Amino acid sequence: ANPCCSNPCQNRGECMSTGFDQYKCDCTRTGFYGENCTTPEFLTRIKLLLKPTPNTVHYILTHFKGVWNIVNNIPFLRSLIMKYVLTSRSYLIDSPPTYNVHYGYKSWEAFSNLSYYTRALPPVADDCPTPMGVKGNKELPDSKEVLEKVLLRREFIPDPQGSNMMFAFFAQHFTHQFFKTDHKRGPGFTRGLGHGVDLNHIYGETLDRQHKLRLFKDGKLKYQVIGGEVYPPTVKDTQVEMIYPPHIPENLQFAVGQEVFGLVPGLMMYATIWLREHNRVCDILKQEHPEWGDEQLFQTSRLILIGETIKIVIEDYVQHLSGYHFKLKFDPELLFNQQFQYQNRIASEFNTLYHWHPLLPDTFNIEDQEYSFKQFLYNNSILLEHGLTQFVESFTRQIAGRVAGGRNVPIAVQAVAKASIDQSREMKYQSLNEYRKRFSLKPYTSFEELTGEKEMAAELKALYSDIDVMELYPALLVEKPRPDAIFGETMVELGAPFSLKGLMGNPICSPQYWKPSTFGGEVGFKIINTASIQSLICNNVKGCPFTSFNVQ
Amino acid sequence: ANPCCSNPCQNRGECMSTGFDQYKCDCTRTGFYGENCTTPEFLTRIKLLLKPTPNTVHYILTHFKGVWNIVNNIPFLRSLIMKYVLTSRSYLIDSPPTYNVHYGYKSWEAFSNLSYYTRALPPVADDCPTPMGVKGNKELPDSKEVLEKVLLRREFIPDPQGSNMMFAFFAQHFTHQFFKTDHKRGPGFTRGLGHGVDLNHIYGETLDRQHKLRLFKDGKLKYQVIGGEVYPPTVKDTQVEMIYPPHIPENLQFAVGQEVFGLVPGLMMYATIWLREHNRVCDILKQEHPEWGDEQLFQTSRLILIGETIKIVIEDYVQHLSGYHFKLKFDPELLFNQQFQYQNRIASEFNTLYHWHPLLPDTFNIEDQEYSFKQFLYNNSILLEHGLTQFVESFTRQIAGRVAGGRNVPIAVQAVAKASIDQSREMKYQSLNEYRKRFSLKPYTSFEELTGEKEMAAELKALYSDIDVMELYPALLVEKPRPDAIFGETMVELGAPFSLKGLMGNPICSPQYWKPSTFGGEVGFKIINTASIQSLICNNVKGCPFTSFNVQ
């Protein structure tokens, strides 16, 4: 019915219904015109003949190690490059946001309501004939079928890039401050109203909760000592609501401030590290500022840890998963002479694409022992038994699984992966090809071009029947990996834009904030500007265990 | 104690304590350096020698009517000018925000917490020796004394600019969607979490409330017919909470959606106009879109009314109060090639400066009759008796009072004006001269330079004793007016930046939103781009009564 169902408008033009059976395209600012925004303006034809493809650019970035090594030591150039990556990725995101689960037209409710995840492409109208609009059968393939045929893991497939468990758990810990689905509401609703890197997973989403985790002395977070070691305080001591199975002994119910973080020792590990880091920064600030009271110590520390997080997320985490020889840079000043919006809203599709469960192993090897999921889950006593040092050491040593390439989703979390398919559809996502087009990729012409192999492709073609109806979630996990890479094109070309906006669109990166005073002086500012995953573990973990997001 | 009390840092540099008795200035990006950021960089010395003063620029803008008349008809120039006014005003506001009642250092709580009004200058530390930091006596002059000596009105003083009661009630109606102090919390806390022009005063702040005001047919707001005329529905019909004295008859309790708007027929007038305008836009959208359902009609209409409001607020309201011969422009595209943040946060100081009660007359003349405050307050039957037409006619005819120039605050609202003084101090505002410095004005050197006269100046000098301790609120109302103007320099030089950010930093002004499809097509877009206070009254009010913000 809805004449817009076929998603006729191209190149980011917007489709609007003009009567029951006709439509119109708003080609404004697209660089195109015509009934569908398919015919290019002049300058557009040139830009197109000069735009290297994602894969081309990707090759250049992962080869010529000798040349990059030289560039990386010319500030004028490194900066010039990083600036480009930042701006060119960002113009891909709508800021301020538009569209959410319930609104496929622009609307104020959509903009104002912070409870929704925003949406990079509008949902498919509720009254379209097929789930993807017009193409395909009345019903999408059985999710159980897709799961089992192309997703589930037979034999564990290690990541060729060397991603270890430090990387996998950091990914899980970090993203879980801004992916916090509100299930009381539905998928598509978030509980993280910060919509970004505000460290709510350390400090708590609400004021009431933060106060319960706080010591109110020297700006510090409450903590306990077990052995000679610092761990978070108990639910009993703080009364902060945490999610634990009823069988968990009272002294093992840790607080930390993202309620879900008790369910995996790997999460509880980072929670501890960061808690230690905060109190560490407090002792530093208190030395430079004997006149400062409890509140400002705490507030300044949180601002510093936010800095540290972004610094590390860009220069170590992203650095690693990118595979680039070019040395990425966290430098807010690169943006001070550019058009850029210091705001952000986390997109449903970012959440969806970030379900990297293939990273998980079949057992968790905390050097010495090997634990199954059942043993590992909600079992902090493991953390206490081994200590942080063993753990860092063990998790740095263990390879995580390859994400793209198909058939690597651990059976232990199959319910999750199915849910991902089901909720994708519940939220009315558009097709894989529609998202590719949305992000300046060329659409796939065959399941075989998507996977880069023959078997899974045939299996998919039997279920979906038409490449143009292939769903976004599955395609991501099944997509042909870049050469010796962990992800395919789609993952990286949707992810980077979402990721960099959430990173750089943080108030502390804005000119008013980005100055020494903001962080208690040159000494606190340095804490941000020299932060690394390595030093985070070095300053806070008992030995000074070597780490990396990289299995050496 | 707090070594930062003396506000030693100049030119917008930030002061930070570095030990109990010493301080440091962060001169980052100010254009200055040195212990206090007082000594200019080179390019700064030049910019300074070329910066015409506010009064100079103001002269040029209000004279040469012949030249402006020519410029106003050269698009390339009008646009070029408007662009400049927009960008140059805006760089005066911190965006994203910083500082609020409780935070004089940068902090995350300050940034994240939408319940606070933000603050253009930090508060004075709770442990400073004097209220203004270091200067002045242990205590500020008695508020009752300042009120009575220089504020209260003896003889009504009409505005030399011709501002009428249409202007005064529009100002009150318009600003009361974003000035909504939460008295449960304190001054310095707001209830309008939209922080800007979101038309919550028509539609309601919450979803629950909006639904109660909605008809759920053709996108329309609920309404009743009395006589043959459209007025808002009753509290009884909708159950929407409204503030009315207990003696008000049930059929006179109107709904509208800003709970306070029942307390003045001038407010209830605009509320009705805008309600009519919404349903008018719905009938239009329904014609261009027979396929559209209730929700999208409603949502698109609200987006259009938001446009109309900003269009009118800039090209008629601001136009009028400015006194400029230059024809201001509402054109979001003027910013598309500039650095500008499409966000906003309403500042406590904006609230404070906008207390324009001097505008009010001694009696409200609804042509024929003359009502006192007691008669006018919470008395909608007046609105019913006369109708909208008489009212528009009457209010266009009646001059409002001059705001600056001293001694024009109606005795009827003296409690309010005192409150303003008291709450200013409760919230720890800095001195008038500190705010002047903050907005690139030269500080006043004598009460006599501030007022431009002898009597009130001597009266003030006896109370405050030192010009550097003169409070911001009183100074605004007492300040020497620009020539035949309603406001002085300070009012206009603080106001414009706050006002324009709130206006242009609205999502609909951002490139993604500013296109025809957003508003249901070319026909809806036009409704925005041709809106005027005149046509608003023309399309909605029974005759087609002539109006203006201007007593002719």
Ligand code: HEM
């Ligand atoms: C032992 C390790 C892990 C376990 C036990 C686990 C299990 C789960 C479970 C039970 C859910 C909730 C599913 C639902 O509510 O439908 C979930 C969601 C999710 N998982 Fe994992 N997972 C693990 C590791 C990871 C890792 C390493 C990542 C890396 C990014 C990740 C990414 C996500 C994301 C983004 C969600 C979205 C949930 C939300 O929006 O709150 N997970 N996982």
Ligand code: HEM
């Ligand atoms: C009959 C006309 C008016 C009456 C009876 C009136 C009275 C009041 C009252 C009772 C308050 C709240 C007192 C308090 O919250 O402590 C207030 C606040 C305020 N008034 Fe008016 N006033 C009138 C007209 C105006 C006009 C024409 C303006 C033009 C701008 C204006 C600007 C403001 C502002 C900005 C506030 C503070 C808003 C808030 O935080 O709630 N008022 N006035």
Ligand SMILES: CCCCCCCCO[C@@H]1O[C@H](CO)[C@@H](O)[C@H](O)[C@H]1O
């Ligand atoms: C080749 C080394 C310098 C340039 C690095 C650019 C990093 C990201 O470049 C990306 O390339 C894609 C295709 O060109 C585009 O679609 C993206 O918009 C762009 O961000």
Ligand SMILES: CCCCCCCCO[C@@H]1O[C@H](CO)[C@@H](O)[C@H](O)[C@H]1O
């Ligand atoms: C994780 C293993 C259990 C679920 C798979 C059963 C349903 C279909 O899985 C089949 O089995 C083989 C797997 O190697 C493939 O060769 C087939 O192509 C695949 O379709």
Ligand SMILES: CCCCCCCCO[C@@H]1O[C@H](CO)[C@@H](O)[C@H](O)[C@H]1O
């Ligand atoms: C001759 C100039 C034509 C009108 C343009 C000026 C628009 C506003 O000019 C204002 O002037 C003040 C002092 O220079 C500054 O405080 C502001 O930065 C600026 O916005």
Ligand SMILES: C[C@@H](C(=O)O)c1ccc(-c2ccccc2)c(F)c1
């Ligand atoms: C370095 C940068 C880039 O290539 O532009 C980048 C940023 C973020 C990512 C990323 C981050 C998280 C998920 C998916 C992708 C990326 F793959 C590359």
Ligand SMILES: C[C@@H](C(=O)O)c1ccc(-c2ccccc2)c(F)c1
């Ligand atoms: C025209 C423009 C300007 O001078 O830059 C302008 C904008 C807003 C205002 C204004 C608006 C509200 C309160 C105080 C001042 C102004 F007086 C002038």
